[PDB]
């Protein structure tokens, strides 16, 4: 029965105007406005939510200590870890195959 009203001049059900009903200490029902839900930071390589990392609306990240915005690995709060395994492996092999590539064509040049 206790019905409720918007607390701001905007009377429309827009995403910036979500309401939640709540029982005050005065023992009555009253609307409370609600900020949009934060979405989780995503990985730049694969796109998944990156674990270890807080989820805040973007400016609220400035209000919060550095450890909420990283994990302690290379590429910490940026790429996803299995993603950094890949980067490392591929780097090593390709940097190795480079020496392999060179020595072959150093040999081609002297055997021609």
Smaller CB distance to RNA: residue 33 or 102? 33
Using CB under 7 A as the binding rule, the residues of this chain from 50 to 69 that contact RNA are: 50-63, 65-67, 69
Q: Is position 5 an interface residue for RNA (rule: CB under 7 A)?
A: yes
Mark 65-104 with x for binding to RNA (rule: CB under 7 A) and - for no binding. xxx-xxxxxxxxxxxxxx----------------------
Q: How far apart are CA 94 and CA 90, in angstroms?
A: 6
Smaller CB distance to Mg ion: residue 34 or 94? 34
**Minimum Å distance from CB 3 to Mg ion?**
14
Using CB under 7 A as the binding rule, the residues of this chain from 17 to 56 that contact RNA are: 17-30, 32-33, 35-44, 47-56
Contacts for 75-80: CB closer than 8 Å, 24+ residues apart:
77/41, 77/50, 77/52, 77/53, 78/43, 78/44, 78/50, 79/43, 79/44, 79/45, 79/50, 80/43, 80/45, 80/46, 80/48, 80/50
């Amino acid at each position: 029965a206790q019905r409720v009203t918007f607390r701001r001049r905007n009377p429309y059900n827009t995403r910036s105007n979500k309401i939640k009903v709540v029982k005050t200490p005065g023992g009555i029902l009253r609307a409370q406005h609600v900020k949009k839900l934060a979405t989780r930071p995503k990985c730049g390589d694969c796109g998944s939510a990156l674990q270890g990392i807080s989820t805040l609306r973007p400016r609220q990240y400035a209000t919060v200590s550095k450890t909420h915005k990283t994990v302690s690995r290379a590429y910490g709060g940026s790429r996803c870890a299995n993603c950094v395994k890949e980067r490392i492996i591929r780097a090593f092999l390709i940097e190795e195959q480079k020496i392999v590539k060179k020595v072959v064509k150093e040999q081609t040049e002297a055997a021609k």
